[PDB]
Amino acid sequence: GKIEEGKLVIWINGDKGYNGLAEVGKKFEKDTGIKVTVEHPDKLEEKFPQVAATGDGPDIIFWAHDRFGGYAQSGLLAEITPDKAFQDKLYPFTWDAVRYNGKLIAYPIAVEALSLIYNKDLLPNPPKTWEEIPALDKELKAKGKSALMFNLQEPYFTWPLIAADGGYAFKYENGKYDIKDVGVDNAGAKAGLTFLVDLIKNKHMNADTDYSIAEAAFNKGETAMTINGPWAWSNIDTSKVNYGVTVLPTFKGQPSKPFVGVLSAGINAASPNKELAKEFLENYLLTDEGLEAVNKDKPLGAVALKSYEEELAKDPRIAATMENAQKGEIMPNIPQMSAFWYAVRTAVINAASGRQTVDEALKDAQTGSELYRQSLEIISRYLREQATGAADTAPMGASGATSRKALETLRRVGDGVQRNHETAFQGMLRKLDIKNEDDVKSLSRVMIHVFSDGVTNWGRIVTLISFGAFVAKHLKTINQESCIEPLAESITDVLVRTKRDWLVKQRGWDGFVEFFHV
Ligand SMILES: CO[C@H]1/C(F)=C/C[C@H](C)[C@@H](C)S(=O)(=O)NC(=O)c2ccc3c(c2)N(C[C@@H]2CCO[C@H]21)C[C@@]1(CCCc2cc(Cl)ccc21)CO3
Ligand SMILES: OC[C@H]1O[C@H](O[C@H]2[C@H](O)[C@@H](O)[C@@H](O)O[C@@H]2CO)[C@H](O)[C@@H](O)[C@@H]1O
């Protein structure tokens, strides 16, 4: 389906101030005659890239900025071009969170960081360390309470602990990300997750605790502490708990490091209402009165709009939010963040339930988080050396032995496939009629149709990549060598998205090397 002209459909998460956002929508309707529909579907961050890919979905999508680079890389977002006068009304660091490949891909709304929320009637002074929580829980259990309950199903809430002693997602040094350097299974990450698993094993927490269970327990006065963001404060106000919002506890003397999000509004590339969306976001929502309406429903945190943020800055809950934000780090918006989050969510859940050990769980998470970059490194090098006749001299980098050995295996087995299946390869090449970067882009659909319509095994993966090499050779001979790298990226995208779970179960490219050994 096509997006309907002359209305606005907005998607925002169900924990945010969506009735507040609908009031801003009604003000827009009152001026313009244009109906604004606000929806909060489950798993909207997973649904958006599926429906938007077919030219469907909402006109405007709200999420934290971490998902938006993936969306932008897939052509799902309109470039945002506010004038200088509008850009200067928001803090520059919030604009930086919505910049992807030099282009603004969303409007920033507000800065979110988790804090420790504590019941002052149970815990007059909250604990400064994670390490004192077991003893504190023992004290509280004797009075029929617990120390701490928070969502263990979403790794956002457990990440601050994992990150504290040296866990990291993608390493940041000299003002740039080393996407090859992933810190999911180092000693720091292990120490943090082991502490969490030990809290569970000693019955200080329950592995099944989710968002709803922890909220209800805190807001009924059953647990002394929770971990949550500004959005949660509204329901706590209603409960009349005497609560404080403060700095997260330290682990091994070091601050808990929450991943900081910037709630952001992106415009769908398929929307025929882009001018209405920009008008709504700039002149209705991102105003003192627009942000107030949302903030009164569920608090936004530290708003991007300089004028309204000065008014809210005096709130000690916001001061505490920004203290934790400064100790933490701004999330990347790189396309791999979705894979990172999927990998760590599974690792926390399996470690918490005892399905896997901490070592086993973080091992798998590391492989999952590394999979795109390692797969690209191998696939791009094979395609490029096959096309040119000469290999890449560049160092292989992180997990370089695996990448080197996988490439050597792929040269052996892939050249065998190209030789033996030369007839079919030639026939399919002629059938596809590839001649430019436009035709290369259209291969993704046929590639995913043929590669996924069949069993999952290493032999079929070799075919995917070897035919890729066969096409790369053709692109070089027709003076279309600049298409080879986008082809490699497209093959890699198809492989890692469709076979993510299977690939991780095989120990990634080490499984490939082992399967075809001797
Ligand atoms: C019958 O004719 C096919 C052929 F010869 C199969 C022989 C093989 C060795 C089988 C015995 S198998 O079961 O081991 N493997 C597969 O069946 C298989 C797996 C993946 C795969 C394909 C097959 N493709 C169809 C092949 C290529 C040559 O003839 C087709 C190519 C494919 C789709 C077209 C566009 C395209 C573009 C790029 Cl850049 C890369 C790949 C592709 C998707 O990838
Ligand atoms: O749990 C992984 C998850 O973390 C972040 O999602 C947060 C979001 O930023 C908050 O606004 C709030 O809604 O809670 C969410 C956690 O349930 C990432 O933004 C998201 O991409 C990621 O999957």
UniProtKB/TrEMBL annotation:
- Taxonomic superkingdom: Bacteria
What organism is recorded for this protein?
Serratia sp. (strain FS14)
Shown segment, full-protein numbering: 2 to 368 of 468
Name the UniProt record assigns to this protein = Maltose-binding periplasmic protein,PigG
